Structure formats: structure tokens, C-alpha cells
Ligand binder design. Structure first.
Ligand SMILES: COC(=O)CNC(=O)c1cc(C)on1
Ligand SMILES: COC(=O)CNC(=O)c1cc(C)on1
Ligand SMILES: [Zn+2]
Ligand SMILES: [Zn+2]
Ligand SMILES: [Zn+2]
Ligand SMILES: [Zn+2]
Lengths: 197, 197
């Protein structure tokens, strides 16, 4: 009767948000972005992307940690895998690069749950939680994982971003604010048994 | 790197859809429905509901089995738990009542995965994949489970319903056609590794 995965959440006030050098995108525009996606596809095939969902609470309400690029777009911490790179080892690496500490102290990332899969059929924005009818060579595969945090940690946040804590209700049905992946996190996280430490 | 649950899907042509006596709803209208929900709440508290997701394929495309009530509403097989009734034992019972055989041959239901949770804060239609801000006494809790089918089976379908197989793309972003629970099944099923037998 208890088939649900059990997850420890801690207070947002348990975590320290420091700063480090800016981290700039590989692509200076959307047009550059899909161009580099075409070049790499012809050379090494489908892009493989990994993204981590980090969760906290304040006063027993779960929030998702989102990365805000100035006052423009919201992102989940993650990035592109190299060819032959392990998914889980890759997401740990990408999250050490983004939020890992100035003082070189190892973060202990715990990743044991897949929460979703998304596919990009063309060199265009549209993405789906399945492979569409007729598509044999999708251009990107995005994998999402749940990241269990330690009781406390310090995260060094590149100066050009801010780390914000979004409650679920703000995400729910906000595809325009957030896009179709982040706006379905409430549905995707509903199977978990959160403990509010 | 393989953290995904593995699920066996079979061809739709592997299953037989026979018929049995009509099964009528406890409530003859929406108004009757919320009235009986008020009466039962005051007596035994929050309504507890369970619903099963049954999946097949044809030519390697996953479909969800939906129950259609004439040409009106689409439903997942499930129903209301009695007080002190186990969730999993309840969903098996409710699914034997709905699709179990005229000839009294035991179906073998395999249920090992929670796929979601929904909450109804008032005696009204709106439901959310979380408990909203300020709500201490929600009126209904709905639990969704993945039901692994056997290679073949015969299902006896009450004469007043039809069992239809909906592909994911038809569900995706169709809240008006289907409502907010069924229309988010593609996001919810994306974590599984389907084998297409
Ligand atoms: C929309 O987000 C993605 O596609 C994956 N995330 C990143 O690339 C990323 C970049 C930085 C900094 O932190 N995460
Ligand atoms: C929208 O569906 C529900 O609330 C749960 N399902 C049923 O009550 C139900 C009734 C019959 C027949 O098969 N399933
Ligand atoms: Zn508090
Ligand atoms: Zn793929
Ligand atoms: Zn085929
Ligand atoms: Zn509850």
C-alpha cells in the first residue's frame, strides 16, 4: 500500500547562496543555438541533455530551485553530455561546474530517481514527453532526475544568474511563464512522499 | 545510469474485449454528486479514490485504455475506497467489479508503481497535483497507479461503456477533451522504459 518513494526536504534557510565568476552560454542567440545543434548532429548525432530537480521547503511548502538568467529565462541546472559519457556522472559533473564551491570542497550529489524524458524532433523549439509519430532521428533527448540534497550546503551561484525557490502552485499551468517542462514539475513530483525536516 | 523502471507492453490485438450488464453511477447528476460528497465528508471525512492506468501498444506506439461513458466523459477504471480499506487491495477489487469476467475466472492484477496524487480542496470540480495554500481539510484524495497487464486477457466491459485505446499524442495538452489528470498522463509515463513485446 506504501509504493511511494520517500524524500527528505529541508528548510531553505538551511542552505547558503554565495557567488562566483559569471558562466556564459555556448550560444550568443537562438539562431546560433540551432546552427550549432545542426553541426553537432551531422558529426556525432542526437544531442543528449541532463537536468536536475533540487527541492527544499519553507514552513512545510515544497519549492523547486530554478536558475534565472538575469531577468530573462528560467532553467534547471544541467547541460550537454559528451559522447560515451554516463548520464548520472554527467549531471553530477555539470552541477559541480554550475553550483560547486570557490574553495574546492566536494558537494555530495545523490541521484536515484528518473522523473521524466523529453524529445525535440526538429532543429526548432517544440519538445514532447514521447517520440512523435513518424520521427526516426530526433535531434535532442533531455533526461530529468530528482537530486536529494544534504541537510545543509553552500552553493556558489555564477554572478550572471540568481537561484530562486518557486513554489509548485506558481509553476502549475504556467507554460508561458516557464515552458512545458518546468510547468509540469508539479504533476511529475506528486508521486513522492516528502518528509518536511 | 539505468534508474528507470522497466515495463512490458503487449499488442492491443493480444486482448479480447467482451461485454456484461450495464454498471450505473452512484450519482444521477453533478449536483447529486457534490451533495453525496458533502454528506459522506461530515460522516467519515475525506473521500479516498484510486484509479488504474492500463497500457498496451500497436506497432510499438503506447496507448492508454480509457473507459468512455456512452459518447460523454472519459474515465480511468477505479473508484471510492471504503473506510480502513487498503489502496492496492481496493483498486484490485474496483477493477475486478468493472472489467472482471462473466465466467468467474480470476484476473491477475499487478500493481507496483504510484504515478501521481490529486487533491480536491472544495465541493467543486477544481483538482491540483499538490495541496493548495491555506487548505487543511481537502474533500477528496485521488491516487493513480500503473497496472502491468499479462501477455493476454479477456476483459468484460459493461454494455453502457466502451474501452478505447488513446495514443499519448492525442492526450497531450488536451485538458478540454479529457481534463487535467488524463491529459498529463504523457508527462507522468515518460520515466518508464517500455519494452514492446
Ligand atoms: C534550459 O536548461 C537547459 O537546457 C539545461 N541547463 C543548462 O544548460 C544550465 C546552464 C546553467 C548555468 O545552468 N544550467
Ligand atoms: C473519473 O473516474 C473516476 O473518478 C474513477 N473511475 C470510476 O469511478 C469508474 C467507473 C467505472 C465504470 O469505471 N471507473
Ligand atoms: Zn514553518
Ligand atoms: Zn532516445
Ligand atoms: Zn507493427
Ligand atoms: Zn491526503
Amino acid at each position: 500500500s506504501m509504493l511511494e518513494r520517500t524524500i527528505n526536504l529541508y528548510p531553505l534557510t538551511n542552505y547558503t547562496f554565495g557567488t562566483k565568476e559569471p558562466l556564459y552560454e555556448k550560444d550568443s542567440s537562438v539562431a546560433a543555438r540551432f546552427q550549432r545543434m545542426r553541426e553537432e548532429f551531422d558529426k556525432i548525432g542526437m544531442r543528449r541533455t541532463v537536468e536536475g530537480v533540487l527541492i527544499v521547503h519553507e514552513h512545510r511548502l515544497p519549492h523547486v530551485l530554478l536558475l534565472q538568467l538575469g531577468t530573462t529565462f528560467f532553467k534547471l541546472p544541467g547541460g550537454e553530455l559528451n559522447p560515451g559519457e554516463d548520464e548520472v556522472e554527467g549531471l553530477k559533473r555539470l552541477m559541480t561546474e554550475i553550483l560547486g564551491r570557490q574553495d574546492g570542497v566536494l558537494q555530495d550529489w545523490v541521484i536515484d530517481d528518473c522523473i521524466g524524458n523529453w524529445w525535440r524532433p526538429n532543429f526548432e523549439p517544440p519538445q514532447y514527453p514521447y517520440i512523435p509519430a513518424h520521427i526516426t532521428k530526433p535531434k535532442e533527448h533531455k533526461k530529468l532526475f530528482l537530486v536529494q540534497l544534504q541537510e545543509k550546503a553552500l552553493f556558489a551561484v555564477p554572478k550572471n544568474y540568481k537561484l530562486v525557490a518557486a513554489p509548485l502552485f506558481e509553476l502549475y499551468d504556467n507554460a508561458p511563464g516557464y515552458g512545458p517542462i518546468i510547468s509540469s514539475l508539479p504533476q511529475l513530483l506528486s508521486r513522492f512522499n516528502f518528509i518536511y525536516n
